[PDB]
Amino acid sequence: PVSVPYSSAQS
Amino acid sequence: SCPTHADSLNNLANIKREQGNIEEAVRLYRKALEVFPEFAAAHSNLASVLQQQGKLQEALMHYKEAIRISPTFADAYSNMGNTLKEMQDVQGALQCYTRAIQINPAFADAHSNLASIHKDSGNIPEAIASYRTALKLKPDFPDAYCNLAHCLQIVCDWTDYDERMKKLVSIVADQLEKNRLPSVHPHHSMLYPLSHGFRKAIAERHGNLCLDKINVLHKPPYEHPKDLKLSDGRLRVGYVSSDFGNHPTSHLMQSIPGMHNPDKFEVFCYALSPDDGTNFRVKVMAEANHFIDLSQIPCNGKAADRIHQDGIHILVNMNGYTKGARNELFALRPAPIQAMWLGYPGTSGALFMDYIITDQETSPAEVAEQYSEKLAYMPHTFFIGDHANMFPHLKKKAVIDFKIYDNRIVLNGIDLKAFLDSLPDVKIVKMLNMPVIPMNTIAEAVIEMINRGQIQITINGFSISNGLATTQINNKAATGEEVPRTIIVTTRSQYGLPEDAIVYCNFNQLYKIDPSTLQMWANILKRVPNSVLWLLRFPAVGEPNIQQYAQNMGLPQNRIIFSPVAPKEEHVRRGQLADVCLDTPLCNGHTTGMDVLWAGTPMVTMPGETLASRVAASQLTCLGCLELIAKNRQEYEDIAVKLGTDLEYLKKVRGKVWKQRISSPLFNTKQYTMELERLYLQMWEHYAAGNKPDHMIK
Ligand SMILES: O=c1ccn([C@@H]2O[C@H](COP(=O)(O)OP(=O)(O)O)[C@@H](O)[C@H]2O)c(=O)[nH]1
Ligand SMILES: *[C@@H]1O[C@H](CO)[C@@H](O)[C@H](O)[C@H]1NC(C)=O
């Protein structure tokens, strides 16, 4: 259950 | 008509490109194509520099031509895919990569490109398989290898780890020195053993990417303001983020634009992202002096103008090398002073960034050469968070005694006070202090609601919500967008935690863990015989991997307990159930750090050299808890173990964190803002006095 946005790569 | 002429031209242009001279290369290719229009390879080449210059729309048309002319050109498809990928048309990119593979199954690049799409989509397992294939097909393949390596990192696959690290470094070293754009990404750089020298270089080349992309705009340098005359004495500060909306950035700083002193400051927020609906976006829009949506203005030229236009003195880059970033804007240098802040934990390594806003702990002067920017120090920590505003129902708690623990069964609620007063028997442990509900029938109902798995109950008219059903009772509460209007019960039993254990937690995404980190934790748990480690399936596919290595370190499976990822508010609130957080020393919990501290849950950290690894230390320091800061592996484990076994101590420390998290400056955004303001002034003085950016260590 659930997905939260987080800090990530880019490419 | 002449192919031999056209052929020659091509060769030269290739050369011109070798010596980085894109300018000229392009001119030659276009001439080649004028001599020979049906020239496949020309089209292709030209395409890929147009791509590099960011002329996608056109670059694309060329690849189209190349393919039409030479339909067995696997290579062209694959690059055209990349173009489409960068154009946000994932759909079409996908088609290209697959056609490439089908036309030539042996073609390693397309496999890798495919893997990339998967990777960006979240599907890591498929990303891996595709990388592995690419690698099998072409074993010397840096982009493949490095991406794969990060996938493995993310799911904690640690096969051959040590030797993988060596290879990464070795590949970077090679790439850098052969002047080729390095395969590790600046953001990831922070995770592998590279010299600060290297990390910086990486950031550097990635910065240059923006240069190429703005150079073809041929824009004259901007005229920068020199006084606050035109802006009526107010310094004009531009915040640029693709994260104004529901994303960690906003969960830290949403309050800040609002808290700037209008007498001396005029705040401009430049969204790089469309309004996602959430109250985060609402609030920043409501509170900034000017809110400016740049996702409207795809062209960097136009957007850069629009900034300059607004007459910004200081432009703040909340993005670094993360998703959504548009550093081209910074590369265009629309404002006199341009500072990295908050959003990205590393150097930009780029000439267009003047300062990086940090602090003495996070970036002591010893390690200042990590960064290409000059250091601008905030006084305590440069980190900040909205918890005080977002989550004020966790300012106070109460517990229930079912036998006296602060973290076994917990209630928080804005009206909690009011409710306890309707109660008969509330004893009140001192420290404010913690009310304790005795085992009434009340206590029973509540605990029964929890056990029956019910949504919520009523007691003397107050709603008592099961803190697992927050999204069902009010999704706005669950996400942080609202403060809950109920009283919420949180319990170890909800997450299958032992009612009588030491719970050590770490809520970071698992890629922050490496072998040695797990190692340390293993030792702690062995030395604290009655304890468990609490972790997040983040991603789930990582759990069996940890569990695996956990057991070769000789820990029965049941010593580590995984929970699912949860909605922002539940995630924060359930941190109250833990005894101690154990911070990843490879990359500290950043937001995650603040969340754990807000719950009042001491955190034990082991600061390294990279900014990213010293943030928890910095936070703890500002909070006032140096006894949580280890100088090495040894000290870390001891601090852990002491808090694990010496219950007296633990009670003391936990009580401290809990009190300090109010009384210290850490979670105080008003103070933070004011600091940030002086620091801004400092920077401006110094520029307006006519100097070049220099370290602001106050
Ligand atoms: O179960 C969870 C675990 C984490 N988070 C959030 O996920 C983000 C973590 O992203 P990241 O690890 O990039 O943050 P860092 O700690 O590195 O700042 C933050 O909003 C956390 O509060 C969440 O909402 N639920
Ligand atoms: C994730 O995001 C928050 C806000 O952008 C940031 O402060 C933090 O440094 C980021 N975490 C990582 C691991 O980059």
Short mmCIF file of N, CA and C and ligand atoms in Angstrom, two decimals, chain A residues 4-7, chain B residues 248 251 383 507-509 511-512 536 538 564-568 571-572 574 588-593 595, ligand 1:
data_model
loop_
_atom_site.label_atom_id
_atom_site.label_comp_id
_atom_site.label_asym_id
_atom_site.label_seq_id
_atom_site.Cartn_x
_atom_site.Cartn_y
_atom_site.Cartn_z
N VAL A 4 4.86 7.44 -1.73
CA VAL A 4 5.16 8.79 -1.30
C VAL A 4 6.25 9.25 -2.25
N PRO A 5 6.24 10.57 -2.55
CA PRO A 5 7.29 11.18 -3.40
C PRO A 5 8.44 11.39 -2.59
N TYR A 6 9.61 11.25 -3.23
CA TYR A 6 10.87 11.43 -2.51
C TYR A 6 11.95 12.15 -3.35
N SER A 7 13.15 12.42 -2.80
CA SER A 7 14.26 13.03 -3.59
C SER A 7 14.87 11.97 -4.54
N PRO B 248 9.05 16.33 -0.53
CA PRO B 248 9.75 16.73 0.66
C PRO B 248 10.14 18.20 0.79
N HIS B 251 7.57 20.04 2.22
CA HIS B 251 7.33 19.64 3.61
C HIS B 251 8.35 20.19 4.56
N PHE B 383 19.47 22.83 7.51
CA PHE B 383 18.23 22.11 7.48
C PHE B 383 17.07 22.74 8.24
N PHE B 507 13.91 4.60 8.89
CA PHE B 507 12.88 4.78 7.88
C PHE B 507 13.38 5.29 6.53
N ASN B 508 14.67 5.17 6.24
CA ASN B 508 15.18 5.68 4.98
C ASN B 508 14.97 4.69 3.90
N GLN B 509 15.07 5.13 2.68
CA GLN B 509 14.98 4.17 1.61
C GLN B 509 16.20 3.33 1.67
N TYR B 511 18.36 2.10 -0.24
CA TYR B 511 19.64 2.33 -0.95
C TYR B 511 20.68 3.08 -0.07
N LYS B 512 20.25 3.70 1.05
CA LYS B 512 21.18 4.38 1.96
C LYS B 512 22.02 3.40 2.82
N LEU B 536 11.78 -0.19 6.44
CA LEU B 536 10.65 0.02 5.54
C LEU B 536 10.83 -0.78 4.27
N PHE B 538 11.09 -0.58 0.97
CA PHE B 538 11.33 0.75 0.38
C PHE B 538 12.59 0.68 -0.48
N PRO B 564 5.41 -1.58 5.68
CA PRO B 564 5.16 -0.97 4.42
C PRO B 564 5.37 0.54 4.53
N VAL B 565 5.64 1.17 3.38
CA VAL B 565 5.70 2.61 3.38
C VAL B 565 4.32 3.18 3.76
N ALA B 566 4.24 4.33 4.43
CA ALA B 566 2.95 4.84 4.87
C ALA B 566 2.79 6.31 4.47
N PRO B 567 1.56 6.82 4.48
CA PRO B 567 1.27 8.22 4.23
C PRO B 567 2.03 9.12 5.15
N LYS B 568 2.48 10.28 4.66
CA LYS B 568 3.34 11.15 5.45
C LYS B 568 2.95 11.19 6.91
N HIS B 571 3.46 7.77 8.78
CA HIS B 571 4.90 7.61 8.88
C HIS B 571 5.54 8.42 9.98
N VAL B 572 5.18 9.68 10.13
CA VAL B 572 5.85 10.51 11.14
C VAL B 572 5.51 10.10 12.56
N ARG B 574 4.16 7.31 13.66
CA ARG B 574 4.56 5.99 14.15
C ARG B 574 6.03 5.88 14.60
N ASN B 588 23.08 10.13 5.39
CA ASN B 588 22.16 10.35 6.52
C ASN B 588 20.70 10.49 6.06
N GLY B 589 19.80 10.29 7.01
CA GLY B 589 18.41 10.59 6.78
C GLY B 589 18.36 12.08 6.77
N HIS B 590 17.77 12.68 5.76
CA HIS B 590 17.69 14.15 5.77
C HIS B 590 16.35 14.62 6.22
N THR B 591 15.36 14.59 5.32
CA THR B 591 13.99 14.77 5.79
C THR B 591 13.71 13.72 6.88
N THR B 592 14.11 12.47 6.57
CA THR B 592 13.80 11.36 7.41
C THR B 592 14.29 11.67 8.81
N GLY B 593 15.49 12.27 8.90
CA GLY B 593 16.03 12.73 10.15
C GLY B 593 15.02 13.60 10.91
N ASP B 595 11.92 13.94 10.62
CA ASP B 595 10.68 13.26 10.97
C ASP B 595 10.86 12.42 12.27
O1 LIG C 1 6.75 5.47 5.21
C1 LIG C 1 7.19 6.56 4.81
C2 LIG C 1 8.55 6.75 4.71
C3 LIG C 1 9.02 7.97 4.26
N1 LIG C 1 8.14 8.95 3.96
C4 LIG C 1 8.65 10.22 3.41
O2 LIG C 1 9.41 9.98 2.20
C5 LIG C 1 10.31 11.06 2.01
C6 LIG C 1 11.73 10.51 2.09
O3 LIG C 1 12.44 10.85 0.89
P1 LIG C 1 14.03 10.85 0.98
O4 LIG C 1 14.57 9.55 1.65
O5 LIG C 1 14.53 11.36 -0.35
O6 LIG C 1 14.19 12.02 2.10
P2 LIG C 1 15.57 12.26 2.90
O7 LIG C 1 15.35 11.69 4.28
O8 LIG C 1 16.68 11.65 2.01
O9 LIG C 1 15.43 13.75 2.92
C7 LIG C 1 9.95 12.07 3.10
O10 LIG C 1 8.80 12.90 2.71
C8 LIG C 1 9.56 11.13 4.22
O11 LIG C 1 8.88 11.83 5.26
C9 LIG C 1 6.74 8.72 4.06
O12 LIG C 1 5.86 9.60 3.78
N2 LIG C 1 6.32 7.53 4.49
#
